[PDB]
Amino acid sequence: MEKVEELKKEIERLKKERNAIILAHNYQLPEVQDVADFVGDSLELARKATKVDADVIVFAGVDFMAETAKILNPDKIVLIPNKRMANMLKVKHILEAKKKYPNAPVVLYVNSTAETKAYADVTVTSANAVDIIRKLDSDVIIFGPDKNLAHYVAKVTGKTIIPIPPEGHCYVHKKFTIEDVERAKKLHPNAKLMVHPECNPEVQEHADIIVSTGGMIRRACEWDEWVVFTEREMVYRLSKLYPNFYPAKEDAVCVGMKAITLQHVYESLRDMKYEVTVPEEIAEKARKAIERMLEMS
């Protein structure tokens, strides 16, 4: 195609004009990798991000890795070409875990909030998690937010893995967000919203009516169809009750996300599009754990 070749020509030009370097993950599209200056795994990209002299970094990759590069580059401009379950981990979880196991290091999988990396000793990617967790002196380790990875490491190193957030708790109401609220208005515009008390306080604010499980099965008579911010069972239950209800979230996870294409990279260099920002207070704190991971890996 001539479209493709013209894009690459524009991308190469904008590189010099913006003074930009382009990093892409190994799982990105070939066309994106082609224009990328560096292509690698999560760790390689993290390490490459400490050695950038360009004023601008285009991070052709997933969000938390883009964020991780910005944390390594506070005085540069980090861009993610496209628009954007890691918000499960709260700082309180780390404090309660450090209270019971005070000599256990806090290890966070790279997919985590910067706010929580600020309370971690070291970060890991999937490929270095076992390597690093073995290396830590303690045989008791605090680890999150990825349960699967936590179980996996547990199984391979045999060490005592204390997961965060702790298991034995239901996190359904926490996985609702302000963006889930707005979607329930642009869509289902003629409808009022039910919100369980245990939801995000930000979510509680835009809540039309606020009811618990019993409050829902009673006040479900002030509209024809509702938008219920709770366990999905309660959608079928109100449905059977009053045949004259839509779940707050769709089945598909992170829908709306578009893969990063050659055009995305072009439009990002040209518009300085989608800039990754982290508060310096939290960034400079969270940065310690990331650099530690580079030291051990």
Q: Which residues make up each annotated binding site for iminosuccinate?
A: 25, 42, 109-111, 126, 196-198, 213
Return the residue matching tokens 């045989």: 139
Measured CA to CA in angstroms, residue 147 lies from 102, 155, 257, 270 at distances of 21, 12, 24, 40
Q: Which of 9, 13, 83, 151 binds Cl ion (CB under 5 A)?
A: 83
62 binds Cl ion (CB under 5 A): yes
82 binds Cl ion (CB under 5 A): yes
What gap in Å lies between CA 69 and CA 73, rounded to an integer? 6
Residue 177, token pair as written in the block: 């967000």
Residues making contact with its own copies (CB under 8 A): 25, 27-28, 62-63, 85, 100, 111, 126, 130-131, 140, 146-152, 154-158, 160-163, 166-170, 172, 175, 231-233, 247-249, 251-255, 257-259
* 83, interface contact from Cl ion, its own copies, none, CB < 5-8 Å by kind: Cl ion
Residues 211 and 232: beta-carbon distance below 8 Å: no
Q: Which of 25, 76, 237, 287 binds Cl ion (CB under 5 A)?
A: 25
Nearer to Cl ion, 83 or 232 (CB): 83
- Binding-site annotation: residue ranges: 25, 42, 109-111, 126, 170, 196-198, 213, 254
Measured CA to CA in angstroms, residue 41 lies from 68, 186, 274 at distances of 13, 37, 22
* 144, interface contact from its own copies, Cl ion, none, CB < 5-8 Å by kind: none
Scan residues 93-152 and list those touching Cl ion (CB under 5 A): none
Nearer to its own copies, 73 or 111 (CB): 111
Pairing of strands 227-229, 193-195: parallel
Of 268, 290, 227, residue with least CA distance to 48: 290
SS3 call for 124 = strand
Residues 173 and 229: beta-carbon distance below 8 Å: yes
Nearer to its own copies, 142 or 278 (CB): 142
Q: How far is the CB of 215 from its own copies (least distance, A)?
A: 17
* 193, interface contact from its own copies, Cl ion, none, CB < 5-8 Å by kind: none
Nearer to its own copies, 118 or 146 (CB): 146
- Binding-site annotation: residue ranges for [4Fe-4S] cluster: 170, 254
For the beta sheet containing 20-25, the strands, ordered from the edge strand earlier in sequence to the opposite edge, are 38-40, 20-25, 56-60, 77-79
What gap in Å lies between CA 72 and CA 51, rounded to an integer? 9
What gap in Å lies between CA 159 and CA 138, rounded to an integer? 9
Helix H or strand E encompassing 142: strand 140-144
258 binds Cl ion (CB under 5 A): yes
Residue 219, token pair as written in the block: 């006040």
Q: Which of 23, 61, 128, 266 binds Cl ion (CB under 5 A)?
A: 61
Q: How far is the CB of 32 from its own copies (least distance, A)?
A: 11
User: Footprint of Cl ion on this chain (CB under 5 A)?
Assistant: 25, 61-62, 65, 82-83, 258
